[PDB]
């Protein structure tokens, strides 16, 4: 119920409950169970896409992700179908640590890991938002109006799973960072 899988320091509910139930629904089965069972989730958040189909974002412990990666496509396919009208995906909760000041104080708290920096984390978010494709490259555009836009290049193959999504990834990303993201396709070295 709420207790097990919607935990991570808060019980709660509603959607988390629905999705969890959906996972159980999937759980009845074969190889489409036992493999999942281990997987667990911290929380779910829902945020929309501009005309109005919402996207559902799921949070993962991070040690878990390799396994989630293991399934992903098949699971997402199920969650989109059972829960339709939403774009489902998977993001790992990452900690982020503040850069020390100085007088922040500083009781030289244990170093911290780049694998804890806000930029690194955000990069991870970008990596997580799209899936099996791969981010081929990136560029940043400085708009006349002091604005910045990040062009995130994408692979080509197997993309289709993401193609329809793109707009949500942009919106979702915004909700998290407040930065603007855009997507593109390549090229194929020759």
């Amino acid at each position: 119920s709420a207790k097990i899988v919607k935990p991570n320091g808060e019980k709660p509910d509603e959607f988390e409950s629905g999705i969890s139930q959906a996972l159980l629904e999937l759980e009845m089965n074969s190889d489409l169970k036992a493999q999942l069972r281990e997987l667990n989730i911290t929380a779910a958040k829902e945020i929309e896409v501009g005309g109005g189909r919402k996207a559902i974002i799921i949070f993962v412990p991070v040690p878990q992700l390799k396994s989630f990666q293991k399934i992903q496509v098949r699971l997402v396919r199920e969650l989109e179908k059972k829960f339709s009208g939403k774009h489902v995906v998977f993001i790992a909760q990452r900690r982020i640590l503040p850069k020390p000041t100085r007088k922040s104080r500083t009781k030289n708290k244990q170093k911290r890991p780049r694998s804890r920096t806000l930029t690194a984390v955000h990069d991870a978010i970008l990596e997580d938002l799209v899936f099996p494709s791969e981010i081929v490259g990136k560029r940043i555009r400085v708009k006349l109006d002091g604005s910045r836009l990040i062009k995130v290049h994408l692979d080509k193959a197997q993309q289709n799973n993401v193609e329809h999504k793109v707009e949500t990834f942009s919106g979702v990303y915004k909700k998290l960072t407040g930065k603007d993201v855009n997507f593109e396709f390549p090229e194929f070295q020759l």
């Binding site: 990596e127 791969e134 981010i135 081929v136 490259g137 692979d155």
Partner: protein, 150 residues
């Protein structure tokens, strides 16, 4: 460009972007770490392990299929040897040049070259020492160097 000559030459790896992959790469961390350790048993250097792994068996970079550089893998198993390999091959090279110069006292080129090599060594050791790898007070000496490299 270059340190002990006027050579310019740009030349390199050119390492790949793609964050992940290879994808056509199955195997596993398990697999190649075993592979690495077994090769290092045989006496192979990390450069050498990376090459042979690269060409014979699928490993584009050992880093990527395992979050660790080959040397770090070796050291963690307990395969790291006494001085870093670059320093080794330098010391060994200055040895072979030194042996050749003892044979042929008439070769001024060789004497020049020996100096160059030796300077490169002393600076490298200064760097390793600054960085704990070598005990502060480490030095390379002709006398003892011969005995050191083998």
């Amino acid at each position: 460009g270059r340190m002990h000559a006027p050579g310019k030459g740009l030349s390199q790896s050119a390492l790949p972007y793609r964050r992940s992959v290879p994808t056509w790469l199955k195997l596993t961390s398990d697999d190649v770490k075993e592979q690495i350790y077994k090769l290092a048993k045989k006496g192979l250097t990390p450069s050498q392990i990376g090459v042979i792994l690269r060409d014979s068996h699928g490993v584009a970079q050992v880093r990527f299929v395992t979050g660790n550089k080959i040397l770090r893998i070796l050291k963690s198993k307990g395969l790291a040897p006494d001085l870093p390999e670059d320093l080794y091959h330098l010391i060994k090279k200055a040895v072979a040049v030194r042996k050749h110069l003892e044979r042929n006292r008439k070769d001024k080129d060789a004497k020049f070259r020996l100096i160059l090599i030796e300077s490169r060594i002393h600076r490298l050791a200064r760097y390793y020492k600054t960085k704990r790898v070598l005990p502060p007070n480490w030095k390379y000496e002709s006398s003892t160097a011969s005995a050191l490299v083998a």
